Every structure is written in C-alpha cells, then in structure tokens.
Amino acid sequence: MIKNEIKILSDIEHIKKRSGMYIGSSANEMHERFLFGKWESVQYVPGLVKLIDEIIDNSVDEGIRTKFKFANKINVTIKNNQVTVEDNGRGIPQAMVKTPTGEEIPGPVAAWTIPKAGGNFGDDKERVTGGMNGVGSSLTNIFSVMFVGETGDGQNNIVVRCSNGMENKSWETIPGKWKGTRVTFIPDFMSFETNELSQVYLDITLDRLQTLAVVYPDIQFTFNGKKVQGNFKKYARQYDEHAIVQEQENCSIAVGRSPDGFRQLTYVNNIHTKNGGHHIDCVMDDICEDLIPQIKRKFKIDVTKARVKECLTIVMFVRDMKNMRFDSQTKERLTSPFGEIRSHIQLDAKKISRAILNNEAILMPIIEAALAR
Amino acid sequence: MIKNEIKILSDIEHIKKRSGMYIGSSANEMHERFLFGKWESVQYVPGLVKLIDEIIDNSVDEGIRTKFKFANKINVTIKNNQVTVEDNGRGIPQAMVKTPTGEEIPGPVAAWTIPKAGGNFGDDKERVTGGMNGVGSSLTNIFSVMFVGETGDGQNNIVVRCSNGMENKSWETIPGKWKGTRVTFIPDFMSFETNELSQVYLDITLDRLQTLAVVYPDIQFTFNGKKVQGNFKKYARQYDEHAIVQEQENCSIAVGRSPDGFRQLTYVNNIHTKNGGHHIDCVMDDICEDLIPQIKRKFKIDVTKARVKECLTIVMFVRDMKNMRFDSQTKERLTSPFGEIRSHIQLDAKKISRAILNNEAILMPIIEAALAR
Numbered sequence A, B: 001m002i003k004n005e006i007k008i009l010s011d012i013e014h015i016k017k018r019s020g021m022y023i024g025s026s027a028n029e030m031h032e033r034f035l036f037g038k039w040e041s042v043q044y045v046p047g048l049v050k051l052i053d054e055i056i057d058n059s060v061d062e063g064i065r066t067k068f069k070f071a072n073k074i075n076v077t078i079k080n081n082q083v084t085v086e087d088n089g090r091g092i093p094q095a096m097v098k099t100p101t102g103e104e105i106p107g108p109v110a111a112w113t114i115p116k117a118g119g120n121f122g123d124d125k126e127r128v129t130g131g132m133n134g135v136g137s138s139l140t141n142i143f144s145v146m147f148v149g150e151t152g153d154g155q156n157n158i159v160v161r162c163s164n165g166m167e168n169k170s171w172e173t174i175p176g177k178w179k180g181t182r183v184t185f186i187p188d189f190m191s192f193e194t195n196e197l198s199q200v201y202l203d204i205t206l207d208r209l210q211t212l213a214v215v216y217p218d219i220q221f222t223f224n225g226k227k228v229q230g231n232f233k234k235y236a237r238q239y240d241e242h243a244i245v246q247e248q249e250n251c252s253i254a255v256g257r258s259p260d261g262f263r264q265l266t267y268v269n270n271i272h273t274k275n276g277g278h279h280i281d282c283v284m285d286d287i288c289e290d291l292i293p294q295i296k297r298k299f300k301i302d303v304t305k306a307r308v309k310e311c312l313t314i315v316m317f318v319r320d321m322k323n324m325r326f327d328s329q330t331k332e333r334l335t336s337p338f339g340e341i342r343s344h345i346q347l348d349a350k351k352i353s354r355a356i357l358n359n360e361a362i363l364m365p366i367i368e369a370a371l372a373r
C-alpha cells in the first residue's frame, strides 16, 4: 500500500522538488523555434534557456523601467557553461527590507536568494516591465552550483555570493563608485537532462538578443563582446524576402509565407509568448474579417479563416503593454483579456489586408492551393 | 520614473497576486475542445476547470493509491456555483505534522489551507499518483469564498472550514465512524473573469467524468447523483463510427478521422494534457515509421508525417505511469523524458498501422487529398 503521509515543504525545497512548475520542462526535447528567421529543428532543455532568459529579461526590464536612459548596454556573455550578464541600470536598491519572519535581509540578497521577492509587485495597471512573478533570478542560482551578483549604486557595491545549489549564501558590502549590475552564475546539470551548454543554447540566446534589439532600438545588446544591430526590415526579410511589414507606435507586424504548416513569432514587451495567446488570435481575426469579404469579391471562392491563416508566418511585436497576465511561469501564453489587448493594440487590419491583397507573392499561393484541393 | 522597491510576499499572498502560474489562465477564452465526442468550440475560464479538476484528481489519486479498494465512488456534484466531491477513501491521516516554523497542526488543515503541503512528495520515481505539487486543494481553497473539507479515518471526523477567501480558517475534530472524504467549496468569482458556474463548466466536468470512467472502469463516478457508465468502445465510437480501437494493459488508443485540421484528446493516469506532450509524439513516430513504407509500397506515393498526422483524431488513455512531470502547474504538457515514456508504454504500432492500412474509410481520404495536390 502507498504510504500517504502529508509532508511540509520549504520554498527552496519545494522549488527544487517541483522545478517543472517553475521553469517549464526540464528534459531535452525537440522544437521548431524560429532560429535567426529560419524555421529549423532545435533540440534543447527549456529550463536552461528559461533560466538564462530570466536574467536577460531582468536586464531588459531595468532598461525599460528607466525609459532606456539607464541599462542600455546589456553585455550578455555565455562561455563554458557560465552565464554572465552586465547592465548599467540603477541596480538593486540598498534600502532595507523586512522578511515575514522579521529578519532584516538587504535588497540584492533577498532578490537573489529567496523566491517571491521582487520589485514588480506594485500596481499592475501601470506595470510595463516583463516581470510579474517575483521568482526566477532566484531560480538560476536556485538551480545553480555558483551564483555571484555584483551590484553597485554609485556609492556602495553589494556582492551576493551563493554556492552548493543556493544552500550556501552570503552578502557583503564594500565602498565603491560602480553603478550597475553584474550577474554571473554556472548552471547545475544535476537537475536538468544535460551536461554542457552547447552551441545551440548560445544560438538561441543570440536569436533572442537579436529579437530584443529589433524590438527595442534604444538598448545596445552585446553578446560575447560583439554589438548587435537592431533593424526591423532586415529582421523581417530574414523570414521571407517578400514579407509585408507594417509598423505602429505600439504594434509592429510582418507577414510572410508558411509552406509546411503554420508558423509565428510574437513578443509582448520583452516576453517571447512562443505558444501564442490572444493577441495573435485577435489580430488574425481582425485581418480575416477584412480578407474574407475582399477575397470573396476578388476571386469569388469561399475560403475559411483557418485555410488562409495556416499559410502565414506572422512575426509581430507589441510594446508598452500593461497588465500582461500569463498562464504559465515560463510566460509562454499571454492570457490578458481580449478587450485590454484590443484597446492597447492599435493595429489597422484594413491596411495590412489591402497590402497582402495587392501582393501576388502571398495570396496567389493560397488561392492556387485552395483551387487545386 | 518607475518606482522600484523590493517587496516580499508569503505563499498565500503571492498566489492571490500571481494566480496566473498556479491555475493557468483566468480570462474566459475560446478553444476547440472535445465535448461529448464532438470537436466543438467552447468558451470558458481554464482556472475554474483546473480548480475542480484538482479536487477530482486528488479523489482519483486516493482511489488508485488504495488500488481502487477505497475511494471507488467519487460522487461529484456541481449545483448553484458549488462543488461537492465525495469519496469513500482512507482519508487524511490524523497524525500531527510539524511546519518548518515549528507549529503543530493537523493533517487535513495543513493540506487544505496552506500550499506547498502534500502527501505526494515521495520518491519522484515512485509517484503513481496524478498529483505532484502539493498545492492543488490548497489552491482551490484559496480561491473559494467558502470551503468545507470533512474527512474521516473511521475513528474521528476532521472538519476544516475556510471562509472569506483563505483569510478565515478553523479545524475541528469530533468523535465519529465515517470513513472517507468530502470536499465542498464555492469558488470566488471576484478574481476570475466570470460570475457563475454556468452550464458549459458542468458540461466540461461531466465530459471529464465520462472520460475518467472510461479510462478507470472500477471507479463509479456519479455526477449530480447520476451514475456515469464507462465503456471505451462506445466512447470511441462517439467520436467517429469507423474509429479503430486498440486496448492494452496500460494504453488504450482510438483512431478516427479529422476533416478540419488535427484533433486529439490524451490522458496520462488521470490528467488531461490537452496540449499534448511527449507520449503522443512517440505514438505518432512509431505509427508513421511503419505506415509510411507501407503506403509507399501500396499506392506508390510519398507523403510526409505531418500530412498523414493532421487528418487523424486520436484518443489515447495511459494508466499507472510513474515519474511524470509537467511544464505547468495545470499539468497540460507531460515533460517526462522520451525514453521513460517509451519504456513504460508497450504500444505495438505495427498492429494499428496494419489495421489503419486495411481500412478504406480513413486512409482513403488521406490518399485522395494527397492525389488532389
């Protein structure tokens, strides 16, 4: 008989025992991510990419919450299964904060050593950064053999050092004049199903850095000491040379061709909702409510919404969004209410619909495939 | 400027603030789901469905942990925005449990009021239960205006009463002789994007109860006092009359026809991974690696794996699967390693490939579509 004994778990212990809920999958798997604009087959562990992207997203959040004035040179380096992110933001405040137990724990150490502790817990309606869960940076270390974070406020330098899988930790304060953040850690391969950060992880990281540079032209991302140039037109042409691009103040969409199924790549603020959500669905619905009547008047053939939808590879970017509620800790599916997404996103469906109706490189393959079948 | 102040939250407060990662979505969205064998478009909040499925999963988990000797009558009732799940299982042990803070609290109250507490935290390679996180019933009690958990081990009735949305809790013990469990909660709609437990949610719960009675024939689930009859043959024929059925000791498969894209409904133990996972991908690979040479030799045509796959509707049921993990708390993607699932599942793909080849009612549409293009 199975021993049903009700146990009690601590936060660190629960996270280590139940990492699947907090970093997504933890075993190497196959996917079809858009690597550098190519729908190629990729094999990787979502946990490691998620942990790296946690710190990268923290740097991007520091950039965006300061209106890109501070934290605009995010030097991300990944060499020999070691991650090392640098940014020139305001950094962790040195102001004292109080734990529920009453113990006095400073800012950086509380942020980088305990979960459910972050600066994104304020008013949600005005939250613009990509962080909401207050867990995670916590996570690398929490999933790391060594994790040293060096913050500087221009007057003090705070070094938070953790080792033995976050079990050992210590924070120290030194006089200094640095202003920024330098988070460098080494992953723990005992948890994940891997032993080394191969070239594929660096390629995925470079792809997200390129996408973030395209999304945010102000921030100058750097990878392994090499600058990253952010231009949307080249990024969209990397998908298909005949892509149709429409930019707005908060929406930035591009339409390509999907010959072997359905494809997409969407970003909300600085979060890669790679499992879609409601924004892509709402945008595509609005586009189709204009295509279907127009294609009816033009080619006089009845086509369903899904038939047209399955032949487009939409790459779409959203900026300055608020209330980005997700459904997974990995934040892979934007589940914000459709009304809020429609209110914030001001994309003109008629413009893109007319643009792709006027082009023979996209509509004609759809028409030919429908007529042949 | 964005006011950046580090805040620290406990388990309950963080769950209330960040419910997205713990009950999936919280805004009523539209999917295309299998309701009563029909690929019907449905509109609902996944949060409430996950909330009910948590208690139902705990009941089924107790049942299987007793090897169906106990908790074999899971009477589930949903009336007037209220859920009442009763079973005749062993019940929660009265044994005292010591929290990390040192406080002494009973087992039922520890399970039903504070999260990260469960009896499923055994050796992760020996979990035969559909629960792994120790947060489920505590989660459903957090989002409940009222919640009464009445348990009995045959010697004493333990009643845990929670009210005003997790803020009020009170446990009591009375001499008694009842042996079983009864979880009755009324969900709180102030957080969810809904107002009442309308008929769609009852339909979804009844469909899941039918599915559970099909995969688990010993448990006599009764919905609103109405017995649910479980027969896999009729359940499969509900989808498609010409469906091909193959039953094994731990795996049950039913293959049909899909005219409007790809559809699937798969179950591992008692969890509806409605976004697929790694087991169904293994099934597809094993089926295609034998079907493709056969169709190539028969009809002298070349068809890709995706083209054949997308024209099928497969219903798959898996039981007694050990060491299963999920990328989300909602458990909608089984992220166990491919090798472990392949070792556990003893599917014979050659048999189903031969059966589908010998049928001219499902393969012929695929071949006709291939010849059309």
Ligand SMILES: Nc1ncnc2c1ncn2[C@@H]1O[C@H](COP(=O)(O)OP(=O)(O)NP(=O)(O)O)[C@@H](O)[C@H]1O
Pocket: A054, A057, A058, A059, A062, A071, A087, A089, A090, A091, A092, A111, A117, A118, A119, A120, A130, A131, A132, A133, A134, A135, A136, A137, A138, A139, A181, B004, B006
């Ligand atoms: N480069 C940086 N500059 C300034 N502050 C930083 C930087 N990196 C991290 N932080 C702070 O460190 C904390 C990190 O918490 P973290 O574990 O990443 O959860 P989070 O910030 O809420 N994001 P997420 O978990 O993705 O929702 C945040 O409160 C940030 O304020």
Ligand SMILES: Nc1ncnc2c1ncn2[C@@H]1O[C@H](COP(=O)(O)OP(=O)(O)NP(=O)(O)O)[C@@H](O)[C@H]1O
Pocket: A004, A005, A006, B054, B057, B058, B059, B062, B089, B091, B092, B111, B112, B117, B118, B119, B120, B130, B131, B132, B133, B134, B135, B136, B137, B138, B139, B181, B182, B183
């Ligand atoms: N109705 C019940 N019958 C039998 N055992 C129960 C019941 N409710 C709770 N338990 C036990 O008490 C714990 C608390 O329930 P719950 O909060 O759902 O934890 P859990 O089962 O680990 N949840 P999850 O991992 O999300 O499926 C469970 O792990 C069981 O050990």
Ligand SMILES: [Mg+2]
Pocket: A053, A054, A057, A058, A130, A131
């Ligand atoms: Mg983030």
